[PDB]
Amino acid sequence: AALRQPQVAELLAEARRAFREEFGAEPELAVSAPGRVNLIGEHTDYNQGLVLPMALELMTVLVGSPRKDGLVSLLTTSEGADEPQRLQFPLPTAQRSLEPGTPRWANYVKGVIQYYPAAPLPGFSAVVVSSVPLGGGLSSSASLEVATYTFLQQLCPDSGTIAARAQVCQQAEHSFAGMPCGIMDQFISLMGQKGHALLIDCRSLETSLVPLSDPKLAVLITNSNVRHSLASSEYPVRRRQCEEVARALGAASLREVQLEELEAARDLVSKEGFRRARHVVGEIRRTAQAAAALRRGDYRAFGRLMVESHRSLRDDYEVSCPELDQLVEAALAVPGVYGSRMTGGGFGGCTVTLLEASAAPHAMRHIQEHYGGTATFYLSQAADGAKVLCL
Amino acid sequence: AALRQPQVAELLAEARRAFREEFGAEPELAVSAPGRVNLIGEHTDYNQGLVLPMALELMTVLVGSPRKDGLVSLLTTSEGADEPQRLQFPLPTAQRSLEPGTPRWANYVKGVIQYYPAAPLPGFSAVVVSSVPLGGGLSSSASLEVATYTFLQQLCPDSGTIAARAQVCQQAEHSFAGMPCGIMDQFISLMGQKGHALLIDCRSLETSLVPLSDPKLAVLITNSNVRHSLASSEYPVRRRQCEEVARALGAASLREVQLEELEAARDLVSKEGFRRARHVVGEIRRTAQAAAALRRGDYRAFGRLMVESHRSLRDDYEVSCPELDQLVEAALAVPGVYGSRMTGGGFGGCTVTLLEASAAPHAMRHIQEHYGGTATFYLSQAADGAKVLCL
Ligand SMILES: CC1=C(C(=O)Nc2cc(C(=O)O)ccn2)[C@@H](c2ccccc2Cl)N=C(Nc2nc3ccc(F)cc3o2)N1
Ligand SMILES: CC1=C(C(=O)Nc2cc(C(=O)O)ccn2)[C@H](c2ccccc2Cl)N=C(Nc2nc3ccc(F)cc3o2)N1
Ligand SMILES: CC1=C(C(=O)Nc2cc(C(=O)O)ccn2)[C@H](c2ccccc2Cl)N=C(Nc2nc3ccc(F)cc3o2)N1
Ligand SMILES: OC[C@H]1O[C@H](O)[C@H](O)[C@@H](O)[C@H]1O
Ligand SMILES: OC[C@H]1O[C@H](O)[C@H](O)[C@@H](O)[C@H]1O
Ligand code: NA
Numbered sequence: 142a143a144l145r146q147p148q149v150a151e152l153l154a155e156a157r158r159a160f161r162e163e164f165g166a167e168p169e170l171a172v173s174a175p176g177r178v179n180l181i182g183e184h185t186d187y188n189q190g191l192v193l194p195m196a197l198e199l200m201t202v203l204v205g206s207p208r209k210d211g212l213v214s215l216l217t218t219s220e221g222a223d224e225p226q227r228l229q230f231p232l233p234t235a236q237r238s239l240e241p242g243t244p245r246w247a248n249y250v251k252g253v254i255q256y257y258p259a260a261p262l263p264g265f266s267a268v269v270v271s272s273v274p275l276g277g278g279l280s281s282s283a284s285l286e287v288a289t290y291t292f293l294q295q296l297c298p299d300s301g302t303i304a305a306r307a308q309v310c311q312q313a314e315h316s317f318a319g320m321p322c323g324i325m326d327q328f329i330s331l332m333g334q335k336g337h338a339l340l341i342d343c344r345s346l347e348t349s350l351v352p353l354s355d356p357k358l359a360v361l362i363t364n365s366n367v368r369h370s371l372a373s374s375e376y377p378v379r380r381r382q383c384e385e386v387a388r389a390l391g392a393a394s395l396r397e398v399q400l401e402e403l404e405a406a407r408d409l410v411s412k413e414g415f416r417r418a419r420h421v422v423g424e425i426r427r428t429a430q431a432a433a434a435l436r437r438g439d440y441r442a443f444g445r446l447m448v449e450s451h452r453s454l455r456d457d458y459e460v461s462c463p464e465l466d467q468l469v470e471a472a473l474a475v476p477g478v479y480g481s482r483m484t485g486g487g488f489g490g491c492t493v494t495l496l497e498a499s500a501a502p503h504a505m506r507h508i509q510e511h512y513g514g515t516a517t518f519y520l521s522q523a524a525d526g527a528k529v530l531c532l
Numbered sequence: 533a534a535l536r537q538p539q540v541a542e543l544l545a546e547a548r549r550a551f552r553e554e555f556g557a558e559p560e561l562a563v564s565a566p567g568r569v570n571l572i573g574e575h576t577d578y579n580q581g582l583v584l585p586m587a588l589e590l591m592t593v594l595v596g597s598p599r600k601d602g603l604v605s606l607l608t609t610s611e612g613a614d615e616p617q618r619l620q621f622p623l624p625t626a627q628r629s630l631e632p633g634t635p636r637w638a639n640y641v642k643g644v645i646q647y648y649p650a651a652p653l654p655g656f657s658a659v660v661v662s663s664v665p666l667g668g669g670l671s672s673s674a675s676l677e678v679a680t681y682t683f684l685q686q687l688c689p690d691s692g693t694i695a696a697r698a699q700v701c702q703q704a705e706h707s708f709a710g711m712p713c714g715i716m717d718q719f720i721s722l723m724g725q726k727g728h729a730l731l732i733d734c735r736s737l738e739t740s741l742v743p744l745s746d747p748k749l750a751v752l753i754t755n756s757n758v759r760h761s762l763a764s765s766e767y768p769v770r771r772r773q774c775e776e777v778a779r780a781l782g783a784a785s786l787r788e789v790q791l792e793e794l795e796a797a798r799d800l801v802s803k804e805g806f807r808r809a810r811h812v813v814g815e816i817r818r819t820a821q822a823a824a825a826l827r828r829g830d831y832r833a834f835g836r837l838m839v840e841s842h843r844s845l846r847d848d849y850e851v852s853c854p855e856l857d858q859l860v861e862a863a864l865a866v867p868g869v870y871g872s873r874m875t876g877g878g879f880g881g882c883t884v885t886l887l888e889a890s891a892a893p894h895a896m897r898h899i900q901e902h903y904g905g906t907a908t909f910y911l912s913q914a915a916d917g918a919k920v921l922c923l
């Protein structure tokens with residue numbers, strides 16, 4: 142029993158209603174920006190690797206209007222968001238930059254404003270709503286940043302590429318949330334096309350659309366409904382460790398390293414650094430091969446590469462957890478399932494499973510059965526990326 | 533001096549003004565869709581080959597509103613559009629379809645209406661304005677088809693992918709304009725992105741967005757300001773000879789014939805047919821090589837491939853003309869020019885030239901001085917594709 146994914150109209154209607162009540166008039170401007178699931182290619186983006194995500198129908202919607210007084214006035218209805226759920230602050234100026242603070246949700250919006258590259262930006266009033274489960278590993282924060290960015294463009298048009306916009310949002314994440322993420326989540330939020338996954342080269346920033354127009358193929362997202370303590374915590378540790386192995390081999394990044402050279406330099410790096418790098422180098426290759434497999438509709442090869450991804454994440458990268466692992470095994474048991482793995486950052490969040498559409502009802506029954514906690518499910522079609530909604 | 537390329541704000545103001553005057557009120561909706569230049573990979577798209585175009589800052593803008601009376605009412609301000617520049621007709625029904633007629637510009641709009649895949653489409657009033665030179669080989673027609681399609685989506689949302697939209701527009705062109713084009717021009721108008729070229733695999737319909745980010749380089753477009761009597765005419769003949777050569781070789785398309793295989797099979801095909809197919813099969817190889825050169829930043833190699841493309845089109849495919857050849861040779865004599873070739877269908881239209889951006893003033897003077905006609909020029913950056921503009 143998959144979760145009804147609210148369509149853009151229901152989200153818009155919630156956004157506008159709350160805006161009216163809060164501000165005393167209709168909003169002038171509106172935007173949407175989706176979350177994402179990564180099909181394969183985990184912990185490779187900040188290593189200048191390859192990733193293969195798709196945009197989801199789960200999305201963040203933001204409505205608003207310019208002001209004349211230089212202030213930003215925000216309201217979110219999102220029920221998980223930390224309080225307060227309203228916030229105001231001045232626009233950054235030459236005299237005074239904004240800073241990270243509480244509530245944490247607002248730091249994503251503050252950051253994007255701070256680094257927005259075009260001027261002059263007026264103040265604004267806005268309400269944000271989201272169907273993206275909050276920090277459950279489908280990029281809620283990126284959807285919020287890219288929604289913000291896309292709204293600011295309506296107030297004050299920018300002049301660069303789409304990669305530059307993704308980089309602005311990434312910068313907000315680094316400086317205002319203390320989270321040194323790669324570019325994947327932002328970039329897919331911006332670049333998603335419905336009926337397509339995106340092979341993103343995080344070194345070149347070349348992207349290619351890979352079809353998913355098979356009605357016999359389903360992508361099932363299972364949320365573990367767990368978020369252990371370590372996104373805050375362990376993600377920046379894995380990044381630094383990767384960067385250190387690259388530095389030690391005289392490589393600009395691990396993208397430049399392959400498994401033979403790594404093995405020959407075992408003595409130059411920690412045992413644990415070796416294992417992390419081994420994951421990354423292998424994951425880059427798996428992603429390139431998975432993309433090719435996906436293209437020729439060889440789902441079986443694709444699902445195999447997914448499973449190898451999961452084992453490498455669990456064992457070498459150590460960013461799985463008992464729950465994700467159990468969900469993965471539960472799903473692998475089901476006839477018609479090609480593959481399953483954790484997706485996103487790890488320590489919680491969701492698995493992604495590729496399967497025959499007709500197995501999806503049994504898949505969901507059996508996973509729920511064989512999981513201790515309580516899963517939720519999304520039956521997920523690949524979706525468009527960010528856009529303006531004309532009011 | 534390059535011709536000025538009006539920005540979207542200026543085209544939108546012209547279109548709103550024409551619309552106010554013609555229909556008595558502000559328009560409700562707006563869209564834009566760009567023209568294009570093809571960097572390399574000519575007369576390959578209908579051979580299921582590879583093409584490498586980019587969208588231009590020259591574009592078509594449509595503003596309009598829904599009607600209640602089931603009528604379509606149109607007006608263009610584009611100065612060389614054939615008469616009448618305003619007209620009105622009822623929507624097609626199940627019993628009665630639209631048909632190709634006069635004027636020719638409106639056939640593009642009629643065709644997209646006729647094949648528009650969603651229902652119910654209301655009547656509408658629209659103004660179309662364009663900076664794409666009509667019939668100058670920068671795909672004014674595709675930009676009009678795509679702007680129309682994008683506008684129809686605001687009246688009645690469609691449900692397929694971006695590639696399906698490209699195909700609707702192609703079908704409109706085949707049936708309403710007698711022009712059996714490939715997919716390239718529609719695809720690039722829909723999928724272009726600022727700062728990127730688009731590598732289109734016209735067999736699988738995969739696309740890659742390839743960054744063009746070297747600010748020391750430019751693309752100079754030279755309009756010969758000639759269009760001989762053959763867009764109409766020799767284009768379908770070429771396409772039909774490619775088809776017969778493929779059939780004679782037992783191949784589904786020339787995409788499945790390798791250059792060395794073709795060379796050994798001279799006896800299976802006519803002399804002329806061989807030469808046509810040699811152009812096509814070689815050009816597909818050149819396109820893959822050119823994309824690789826672009827990725828590695830090798831503009832000298834990219835340029836040499838462009839020149840080889842031109843020589844092939846000129847001698848093997850015979851779709852150049854003496855103006856284009858004179859323009860190409862004049863370009864290649866300027867220091868800082870890496871390559872130059874005809875672009876688009878041939879028999880007139882434009883050349884595309886890759887050069888040091890600092891050589892561009894010298895090149896425009898040298899080329900005009902050494903051209904028997906009157907060239908016009910554009911310095912165009914890679915631009916965005918089709919979009920909605922909120923009024
Ligand atoms: C900066 C830039 C490009 C650009 O369009 N940038 C852009 C545009 C916009 C906008 O539309 O708003 C916004 C943000 N950035 C163009 C360019 C720039 C100036 C005049 C004409 C052109 Cl076409 N291309 C290149 N050059 C390039 N061509 C190559 C060819 C082969 C190759 F192997 C490598 C190549 O490197 N440099
Ligand atoms: C990673 C993250 C958040 C977070 O806590 N980041 C953090 C953690 C730490 C740390 O741990 O020390 C330090 C600094 N930052 C929160 C979040 C996550 C989970 C529960 C509640 C919340 Cl608030 N929000 C988001 N995303 C998000 N909030 C939205 C609100 C509205 C909206 F429309 C869209 C929104 O998308 N993602
Ligand atoms: C290829 C073609 C056209 C053409 O004549 N096609 C044709 C030729 C024949 C034949 O030859 O028998 C038979 C059937 N079709 C015309 C054209 C071409 C040249 C001069 C004047 C015109 Cl009108 N229009 C366009 N494009 C276009 N018209 C626009 C108008 C407004 C607008 F905003 C955008 C527009 O983009 N391109
Ligand atoms: O692949 C793991 C993934 O983890 C988090 O989602 C980050 O936001 C991404 O940049 C990426 O590093
Ligand atoms: O590459 C030649 C080119 O010629 C015309 O522009 C057609 O519209 C395109 O489909 C393509 O065939
Ligand atoms: Na359970």
Ligand code: NA
Pocket residue numbers: 900901902903904905906907
């Ligand atoms: Na001249």
